[PDB]
Design a protein around this ligand. Structure first.
Ligand SMILES: Nc1ncnc2c1c(-c1ccc(Oc3ccccc3)cc1)cn2C1CCOCC1
Ligand SMILES: [Ca+2]
Ligand SMILES: [Cl-]
Length: 430
């Protein structure tokens, strides 16, 4: 008999899902992945709940200061998001020391600014002050920092998870959709802001009938479906009848390209710009890991969400299609040799795009002009706002030999800790 508890409020919007409040306990009846069958102990109604909205009671996830499955960098991203304050903390699964836990505390370093320190935990931090349960431990450091950068104040602002897509609805009838407002158009189709079943806001990429076979496209789209990651835009559904529709999550601030050119973009300081490209490297590192290829990496194909999380879009679409030579590796231009390494070349350009708030690559140069320019060994010069060490990375991405260019794993690893000396990742306690 398994009892779970609601971590967040939820309002039902389908035929057979349950509405519950934060705290309502429930009996699990089935575990079908994203959706679980359950019985509210509050209503006595049996229905479907979003599995990721509840956790076993007295389990750690139930706690407000615990964050399951969070990396150190993301732990550091959520503590620097507005709404938190000096002393804001959290406990999480440690990356390096598996099966153990780590403590992340907000802090102010008069020389860096707002930062986030991390401590490991074996339970105890300092063999001085030992503790029986993370609760005891937590409540301790809440009064007078026991040697910690700061004193534990308020748990980290937690977000409300996205609602899982309707149960078993990868392919939808076109009627389930109202494409309300057109956001963009182009050679291959448009992108619309849409609503799915009067209830769910979404984005739709409509594909002009090319060929680009339909059953050819759908094969890719089923692989596309399996490439899920916090840094890839999420494919919800597909309409399989020419003209094909691709239904995805709606990203509020549109393309990275468009965001960097806007007002809010222009205010973003350099450490933010760096973080953006770090997020994209994380996404590209995932694609690399899964032995996949993007083939059209650039600011235009990066989406920005309301909270400034970057997500790659159009991954794979490039393959299935049917003129951006400025983002393309010489080997891909000359012999059509698209690989993860040519993506890396792309990342280099996209990276310059970012640091120059979306300015076009090779300004004032034509495509032909640039193609010959590259053959002479020409590269874009470092912009003024650009740190020397960041430029050295672009240059590494633009090595004539693909084999010589770094991996996204390495690029991700470097960008993430750009301002943190390796020895300073975790703290050593007195
Ligand atoms: N999903 C989106 N949400 C919000 N804005 C979006 C998108 C999308 C978008 C929607 C679906 C899509 O389809 C995919 C997604 C992943 C892989 C393959 C195709 C790709 C981008 C584009 N855009 C704007 C529209 C044109 O101006 C700048 C970008
Ligand atoms: Ca420097
Ligand atoms: Cl019962």
């Amino acid at each position: 008999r398994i009892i779970v508890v609601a971590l967040y409020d939820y309002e039902a919007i389908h035929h057979e899902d349950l509405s519950f409040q934060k705290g309502d306990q429930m009996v699990v009846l089935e575990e079908s992945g994203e959706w679980w069958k359950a019985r509210s102990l509050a209503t006595r109604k049996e229905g479907y709940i979003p599995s990721n909205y509840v956790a076993r009671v007295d389990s750690l996830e139930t706690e407000e200061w615990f964050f399951k499955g969070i990396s150190r960098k993301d732990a550091e991203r959520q503590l620097l998001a507005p709404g938190n304050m000096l002393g804001s903390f959290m406990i999480r699964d440690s990356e390096t020391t598996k099966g153990s836990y780590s403590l992340s505390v907000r802090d102010y370093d008069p020389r860096q600014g707002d930062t986030v320190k991390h401590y490991k935990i074996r339970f105890y931090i300092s063999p001085r002050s030992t503790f029986s349960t993370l609760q005891e431990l937590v409540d301790h450091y809440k009064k007078g920092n026991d040697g910690l950068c700061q004193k534990l104040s308020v748990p980290c602002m937690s977000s409300k998870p996205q609602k899982p897509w309707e149960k078993d609805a990868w392919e939808i009838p076109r009627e389930s959709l109202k494409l309300e407002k057109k956001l963009g158009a182009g050679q291959f189709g448009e992108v619309w802001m849409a609503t799915y079943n009067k209830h769910t806001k979404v984005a739709v990429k409509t594909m002009k009938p090319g060929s680009m076979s339909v059953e050819a496209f759908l094969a890719e789209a089923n692989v596309m479906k399996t490439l899920q990651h916090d840094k890839l835009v999420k494919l919800h559904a597909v309409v399989t009848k020419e003209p094909i529709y691709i239904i995805t999550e709606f990203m509020a601030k549109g393309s990275l390209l468009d965001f960097l050119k806007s007002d809010e973009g222009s205010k973003q300081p350099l450490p933010k710009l760096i973080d953006f490209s770090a997020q994209i490297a994380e996404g590209m590192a995932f694609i690399e890991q899964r032995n996949y290829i993007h083939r059209d990496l650039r600011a235009a194909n990066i989406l920005v969400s309301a909270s400034l999380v970057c997500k790659i879009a159009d991954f794979g679409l490039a393959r299935v299609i049917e003129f951006p030579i400025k983002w393309t590796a010489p080997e891909a231009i000359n012999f059509g040799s698209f690989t993860i390494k040519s993506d890396v070349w792309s990342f280099g350009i996209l990276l310059m795009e970012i640091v120059t708030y979306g300015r076009i690559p090779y300004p004032g140069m034509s495509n032909p002009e640039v193609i010959r320019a590259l053959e002479r060994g020409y590269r874009m010069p470092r912009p003024e706002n650009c740190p020397e060490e960041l430029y050295n990375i672009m240059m590494r991405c633009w090595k004539n030999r693909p084999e010589e260019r770094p991996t996204f794993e390495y690029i991700q690893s470097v960008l993430d800790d750009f301002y943190t000396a390796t020895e300073s990742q975790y703290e050593e306690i007195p």
